Symmetry: C3
Subunit: 336 residues, 3 copies
């Protein structure tokens, strides 16, 4: 079909880690699916000792919201760069074909907006990210990425073609941050975004992040903001990393079905302990909970997880199953 | 089946790089398979210039021993933390479901033991490692990991379902070490384990290991301690890395059949030159030797292998095959 | 067949990024395919601010040329080390079986040559690299690697066994470089190759490259030296990394069919955004261009690409397709 002859629909985005309401399998034919995002540059507190980032975001969040369409839909995005921002921006969709992912067609200075349409002709989770000429890595590592999910029109399938469902989807964006320090050994705090640029590029070139965070801060997905589920529920965990490799793992769980390269026309792998998201990609895992409790979902470079920030929690309600795991003898003195 | 109604069997563990005797395909029904491991904290010499590590081990070795069961068995582990140790420990099995892999059910202070049972309901090689609250990466990088192998009850299979066998299994645990240096540029030697903690965490956060070793020391699997095989024999090479990515390679060989993500319900890949073990996982490769000689088995970041320690040897007996490789002209002067 | 009873053919190599003329599917039976390469040590300018590398090359280029054979052929290489070089060299073929990949049979001092034959019995892209005893990583990171491609005799196939073709092949070798700096913060320039050794090894052990380049220099595959193609053409992109992981990506394109582990008896994955080449391997991707313009082909650690050098261009001729991507509204003032 010709996109100019198709019906249009408008989607209201939601903030991560939620994903906007959508169908899995659908009876709908292809549509032009309209979205809007507004860029917001802002200073953000990223850890528990007051460190700040001169951040750059789509729609005020790290990651930007997840956009969901079905294969054969057209994505039509209006990208807005308000006059209160300092820098030019654009967007590169890995799900799109041509013009550097759309980056060449979406160059917006502060005070400007643009609208891009592209055919979502390949199923999968795909990164989108800013890519302004001459300062591409800086905008990405400062927060400008998220995920486009293009579902098969018949929903997700296992390697034999059997249907797979999820009850809840969550989106996790992992961000390798490069916060400079001064000669006093303290992280720098900058009054403006432009002031932070040359110091940050120097840290970037060391390839050693100061922090690695989920969803914008150490501990973002913990406490009141933990992910939630129940025994018997199947969750889809979408994981994006626009710049650097990561290795997701659910402590005390598994990836039941995982597309680590994130492309749903390929058969998934089952029973994974840890999977691998290549820098510059998004992947997806399904898991059905069988035990209650508080799980950790983390990057299994455990230094990156526990020392630098790349870890969250999932609080799961339900009945403990002693067939799967039982404490036979609690900790007690060693017999002599 | 209900584990409380099943027969029990006890396994005697052996030290790496060997793997305790086991069946591949079996006619046995499911069992409760009992194991015991005793934690040993100890100072270890890890290189040829006298550098020491304040190490932490399962059963006195790096890696801990490999535990082998079949899918549908229950693993029942007694974990002992003698009063001669300084730190609390526990164990997280990636092969297990619930309670942070069993970590929440196995918290043993010095002087204590505990017994955990879990269903091994997924086939594959899976990491196990210590994970005490608040100091998880330190115990892992100090030596506390090994592998659980859960074999399919019908043995290993290729992508078309044809049977695959091994004649010998070897287990290789690769350890990224973070040994601090003092202001004199020498590696530090500590009188106690606790003394080493804060200096080590600082090195860990740089994400740059001082050493990367197989099986506890530079050169551990060389000389008298080389792996061995013969032409015509098929070996299974189990490779674990609980914290950091690695890329195994057999110089002058291949991975005939490789499960790089380590999960036997997925079809393996064939003819690999180099495979990839995600940090936080164990994988497995089969190879049938066709040429005699001394092979190297290494991490193919060659700096990590040759400069930092991530390399071993395999000495293979048998008849040279000129059909596979022949020296046509030995080194000699260039003609003019 | 017995190689001594087969017909011989001689191939004239070409310089990267081209690949010598070859058939995909062939009616030919197996042959002994003869090649010659001459080692050249030379100082090379690797960036736009005059930094030099004391380099080591096969046939004067980084990477060495790509050698193409079909499965069941024998590769017969004459390796020449002229008396104008300073160091001993050899070659390790990951496509070969035995004698450390051929390294033990090809030890050539300056003034010597040797000839090696091996059976190419496994299909795929395979790294070859120098591996002289005691200085293996130094020769590799200084430039001594390239690719052997062993095509299936029936050409490339998709996961269902349907034929796949390419119209043009390009070879990209990615090199992590370790250029020392002096106490003045400037990169060192050395008068001889041997002078550079101890300083370079120290940088290598930090695991942080100073530069990461395609094909021997920052910008090597840009400007007049950009790759080229047309809409409707299918290209094969061969990517080698002998020492360190990389994550190839085509901006505004995809990997239509990708063998990321590089072994053609395994089914490829489709629709990839970014793929993963393990250090010590070569992989291959097919893409059919659908839009004209200048694409970037890069390592999607964007710091590694844009700050350190791991990026090239592909200039593609043809007709823009608004069905795939259209600018609906060009950048303009935000409405109030
Ligand atoms: Zn319309
Ligand atoms: Zn459900
Ligand atoms: Zn990108
Ligand atoms: Zn019992
Ligand atoms: Zn055998
Ligand atoms: Zn773990
Ligand atoms: Zn002949
Ligand atoms: Zn064509
Ligand atoms: Zn090699």
């Amino acid at each position: 079909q010709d996109a100019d002859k198709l019906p249009h629909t408008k989607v209201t985005l939601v903030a991560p880690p939620q994903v906007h309401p959508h169908e899995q399998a659908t009876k709908s034919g292809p549509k032009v699916v309209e979205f809007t995002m507004t860029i917001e540059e802002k200073k953000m507190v990223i850890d528990d000792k007051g460190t700040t980032l001169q951040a750059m975001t789509f729609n005020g969040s790290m990651p930007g919201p997840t956009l969901v369409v079905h294969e054969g839909d057209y994505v039509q995005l209006t990208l807005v760069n308000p006059a209160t921002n300092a820098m030019p921006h654009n967007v590169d969709f890995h799900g799109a074909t041509g013009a550097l992912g759309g980056a060449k067609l979406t160059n917006v200075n502060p005070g400007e907006q643009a609208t891009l349409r592209f055919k979502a002709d390949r199923s999968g989770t795909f990164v989108y990210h800013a890519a302004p000429e001459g300062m591409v890595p800086w905008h990405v590592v400062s927060g400008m990425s998220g995920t486009l999910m293009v579902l098969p029109r018949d929903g997700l399938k296992d390697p034999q073609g059997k249907p797979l469902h999820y009850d809840r989807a969550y989106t996790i964006g992992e961000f390798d941050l490069y916060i400079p320090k001064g000669p006093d050994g303290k992280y720098k705090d900058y009054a403006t975004l432009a002031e932070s640029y040359g110091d940050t590029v120097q840290v970037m070139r060391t390839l050693t992040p100061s922090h690695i965070v989920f969803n914008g801060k150490v501990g973002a997905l913990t406490g009141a903001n933990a992910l939630t589920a129940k025994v018997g529920e199947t969750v889809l965990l979408i994981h994006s990393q626009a710049n650097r490799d990561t290795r997701p793992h659910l402590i005390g769980g598994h990836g039941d079905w995982v597309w680590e390269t994130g492309k749903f026309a390929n058969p998934p792998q089952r029973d994974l302990e840890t999977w691998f998201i290549r820098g510059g990609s998004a992947g997806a895992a399904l898991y059905t909970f069988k035990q209650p409790g508080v799980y950790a979902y983390l990057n299994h470079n455990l230094i990156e997880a526990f020392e630098l920030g790349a870890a969250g929690h999932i609080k799961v309600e339900g009945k403990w199953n002693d067939d799967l795991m039982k404490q036979i003898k609690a900790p007690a003195p060693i017999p002599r």
